[PDB]
Design a protein around this ligand. Structure first.
Ligand SMILES: CN(C)CCCn1ccc2cc(-c3nc(S(C)(=O)=O)nc4[nH]ccc34)ccc21
Length: 108
């Protein structure tokens, strides 16, 4: 996908902030605390979270949209692999990803 422009980055900031503000997003705001998730970091080999993505956005880490979508998608894949499908954490990923899709389409 095409190189991110400066205006692109403003839209990414906006998408990121919308996700950070969502009621269901609290489990993903910061790196998982291993006290809150037993053996999380033995299970999950590529952790990701919204504070880590915000750092990357601020530093202009992303060069194409697909890299941004990749990190976001890691957040939901991680949660759904680590937790069972009836968990409330799993549902939090269901809700937030569909919101991300809605916002991503708006971004393009
Ligand atoms: C520091 N702590 C002592 C107080 C803060 C409370 N708190 C803040 C975020 C958060 C996330 C989980 C969690 N997150 C996920 S995740 C990212 O995969 O959706 N899966 C899980 N399974 C079981 C638990 C759990 C649990 C508690 C949490």
């Amino acid at each position: 996908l095409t190189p991110l422009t400066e205006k692109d980055y403003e839209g990414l900031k906006r998408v990121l902030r919308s996700l950070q503000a969502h009621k269901m997003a609290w489990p993903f705001l910061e790196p998982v605390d291993p006290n809150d998730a037993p053996d999380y970091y033995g299970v999950i080999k590529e952790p990701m979270d919204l504070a880590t993505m915000e750092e990357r956005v601020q530093r202009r880490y992303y060069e194409k949209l697909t890299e941004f979508v990749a990190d976001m998608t890691k957040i939901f894949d991680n949660c759904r692999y680590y937790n069972p499908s009836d968990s409330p954490f799993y549902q939090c990923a269901e809700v937030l990803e569909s919101f991300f899709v809605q916002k991503l389409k708006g971004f393009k």
